[PDB]
Structure formats: structure tokens, C-alpha cells
Amino acid sequence: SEKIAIRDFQVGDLVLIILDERHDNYVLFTVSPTLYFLHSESLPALDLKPASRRPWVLGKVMEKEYCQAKKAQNRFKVPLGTKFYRVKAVSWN
Amino acid sequence: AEFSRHSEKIAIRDFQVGDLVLIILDERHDNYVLFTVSPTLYFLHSESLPALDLKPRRPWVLGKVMEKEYCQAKKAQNRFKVPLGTKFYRVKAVSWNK
């Protein structure tokens, strides 16, 4: 049976996707100090939307992209220089 | 394989001793449960609450399964708020960090 990854996310991992209101974004539930932000493109297929939002959904990792915040005002509400991932995911059930 | 990917995943069904798990508050059953995708309920044993820093409010903790016991409700009024005849598990668990 499949388990949910909570760190070191790989393509094909099952993940718990949760709302992070501080960063105005969905993230992967993790014990890591690194932020894994859900790519905006993946929201529709997970029955998620860009005013109250569902707290969590299960998904499967399809893609991840390494990023560094090079502008202070960014869509992720992270400080300048933050190193993070953007993750595309699809639904699982 | 010469090595395993170690301690990077939590179980969400068919829980086995030693599994890492997400423990969550089940308000409708007035009890902590293992987060699961299966219809079977896995209730946290009352013995396990103090060492997890829970009280008989905190929404969730990561844990490790120390024991599971398959049970059936014999009375309609019971601490788990389940109908008479419900089959469920009681799980002992300790905190897990890393």
C-alpha cells in the first residue's frame, strides 16, 4: 500500500497538500525546513482554487522546480533570497 | 537493494507496528485517531496521550505505532461514539521527531 512522503519529495510520491495561510499558498506537508509550494497550475485538478479555502487534499507529485526568491514582494510571501521548490501535483484516490 | 529510503513516509492505511503516522483530533468521535484513507477507525489509546502532550485541543502530532488491538463495540453507548457492533482498532503510539 502507498504511504505519504513527508520529506525529500520525489516524482510519484503521495503527498498531503495543505493550506499555508501565512504564505497565501498551498504547500506540501513536510518536516523539512524547506518550503514546497503547490504550483498554481495544479490547483484546478485538485479541486482547489486561487474566499474560504479547503484545508487539505491528497495528491501525487508530478514535477518539482528549484527556485530562489530574487524579489522582495513575491507571490509566496517569503523573504528575499529564500530557496524553495514549486511542485506540480495531480489528484490521487 | 543495498539500502532503503529511511523514515521519509507515513502510513495511511493497514497500520503496522513501527509505522510513522499522523495523529489527528476526531471531534465527532471525541478522540484522537490515526489519519487514514480507509473506513476503519484507528483510535489512539488513552495511555498514549500524556507522552504525546495531548489532553483528554491540539490538532495533530506525528507518532510511531507501538501496538494495535482489533476491537468490537459491545454496547451502543461507548467512549468512541461508534454504533454497537463497530469493529475498530486501539493504537498505542509515541512521539516521533526528525
Residue numbers in the entry:
A (entry chain A): 1493 to 1542, 1549 to 1591
B (entry chain C): 1487 to 1542, 1551 to 1592
Any passages from the paper?
As a core molecular machinery in mammalian autophagy, the ULK complex is composed of a serine–threonine ULK1/2 kinase, ATG13, ATG101, and FIP200 (also named as RB1CC1), and functions as a master regulator in the initiation of autophagy under the nutrient deprivation condition by linking the upstream nutrient sensors with the downstream autophagy machines. The ULK complex initiates the autophagosome formation, and has recently been implicated in selective autophagy by interacting with autophagy receptors through its FIP200 subunit. Here, we discover that the interactions of FIP200 Claw domain with autophagy receptors CCPG1 and Optineurin can be regulated by the phosphorylation in their respective FIP200-binding regions. In all, our findings uncover a general and phosphoregulatable binding mode shared by many autophagy receptors to interact with FIP200 Claw for autophagosome biogenesis, and are valuable for further understanding the molecular mechanism of selective autophagy.
Interestingly, we also determined an apo-form crystal structure of the FIP200 Claw dimer, in which the highly positively charged LHP region of one Claw monomer is occupied by an aromatic Phe residue together with a preceding negatively charged Glu residue from the remaining sequences of the N-terminal cleaved 3C protease site of a neighboring FIP200 Claw dimer, likely due to crystal packing. Inspired by these structural observations, we inferred that an aromatic residue (Phe, Tyr, or Trp) corresponding to the I106 residue of CCPG1 FIR2 may also occupy the LHP of FIP200. Moreover, the dimerization of the FIP200 Claw domain in the FIP200 Claw/p-CCPG1 FIR2 complex is mediated by more additional polar interactions, such as the two Arg–Asp pairs (Arg1491–Asp1500) and two Arg-Glu pairs (Arg1499-Glu1494) of salt bridges, and buries a much larger surface area compared with that of the apo-form FIP200 Claw (~786 vs ~730 Å2).
